[PDB]
Amino acid sequence: IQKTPQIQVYSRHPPENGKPNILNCYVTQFHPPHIEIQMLKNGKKIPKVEMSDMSFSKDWSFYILAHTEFTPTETDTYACRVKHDSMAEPKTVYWDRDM
């Protein structure tokens, strides 16, 4: 069986330019467990990314959090790019500050 990841990108606090925050990429509801999750700043991989909160749901699908400390600036764009066998191409979800 094969389940496509749901990818959600969000900050811990409502974003304010110049104020430290945390960016999150929660990747959920997927199977099989092999996966690549990269967080990107202006199209470039962010180096210090912490992986945490790995769990499974009742239907055994995998859940995991990538997160990183960050200080937003008005020009910076952030994204999460995920490669999984369920998807022909890597899927990228962009942080939408106004969501």
């Binding site: 069986i1 389940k3 945390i22 960016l23 999150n24 099989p32 467990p33």
Partner: protein, 276 residues
């Protein structure tokens, strides 16, 4: 209220690429507190919550040795199940286990559990009696029979009633400032235009602990559960959680819809609307 100790364990084969990846992730309630990952540079059990600094070197040594033994057991299991199911050595397979216990506010056992899956499907589980197994297929029936002959349920029950509850009590004591805290949600509503003279209203709840929460939208006193989009409550990187729920409403009529937030840290539930 009640509390839980849960281990999420995963073994994943990688034919052609060496030994399986093996991980154990431990939670007290909704908080990650320990982890073992076979792919780390130096694989050992590690603290994932600050209060686990209160355990000495002997704790980390024992848990590490136990994890390494478990890793070897799961390696064997992956090969065993290939035989049970008549599968080739060339494909990746996954074993998953959820193992743990829940206690009441008085520290006494409410429930124990141990559930296994293979390739994302139910395999075998301990029943709520803590004495018998349910097997989902004929492969798992082989495992059930081995475990019956070896007295495995009694060994497992002794863990669940003994070790599991006793360590859970200790973790709750040591981690009380983190685990028994309440962080109140802070909420806000955002507004987005749509085609067709309609409007998305999104109610956000931020910064809360524990994870259990309810967000609803109301029109004229009635909940709109069928028309709502939402996300599953989700961790926000610092031990708190967040959630949103949205509804689509007619332009000009946003004032009539209210978001309601119910949580442990809200003596009275929040009621809010869009603020132009």
């Amino acid at each position: 209220g009640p509390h839980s100790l849960r281990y999420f364990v995963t073994a994943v084969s990688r034919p052609g690429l060496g030994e399986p990846r093996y991980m154990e992730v431990g939670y007290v309630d909704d908080t990650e507190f320990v982890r073992f990952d076979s792919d780390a540079e130096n694989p050992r059990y590690e603290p994932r919550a600050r209060w686990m600094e209160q355990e000495g070197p002997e704790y980390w040594e024992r848990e590490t040795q136990k994890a390494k033994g478990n890793e070897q057991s799961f390696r064997v299991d992956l090969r065993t199940l290939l035989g049970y199911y008549n599968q080739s050595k060339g494909g990746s397979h996954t074993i998953q286990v959820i193992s743990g216990c829940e206690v009441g506010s008085d520290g006494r056992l409410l429930r124990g559990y141990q559930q296994y899956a293979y390739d994302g499907c139910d395999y075998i589980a301990l029943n709520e009696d803590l004495k018998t197994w349910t097997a989902a297929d004929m492969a798992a029936l082989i495992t059930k029979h081995k475990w019956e002959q070896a007295g495995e349920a009694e060994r497992l029950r002794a863990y669940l009633e003994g070790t599991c509850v006793e360590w859970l009590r200790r973790y709750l004591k040591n981690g009380n400032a983190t685990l028994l805290r309440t962080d109140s949600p802070k909420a806000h509503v955002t507004h987005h235009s749509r085609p067709e003279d309609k409007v998305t209203l999104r109610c956000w709840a931020l910064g809360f602990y524990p994870a259990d929460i309810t967000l609803t939208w109301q029109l004229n006193g009635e909940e709109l559960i069928q028309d709502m989009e939402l996300v599953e409550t989700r961790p926000a990187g610092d031990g708190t959680f967040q959630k949103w729920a949205s509804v689509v409403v007619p332009l000009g009529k946003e004032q009539y819809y209210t978001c309601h937030v119910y949580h442990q840290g809200l003596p009275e539930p929040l009621t809010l609307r869009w603020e132009p």
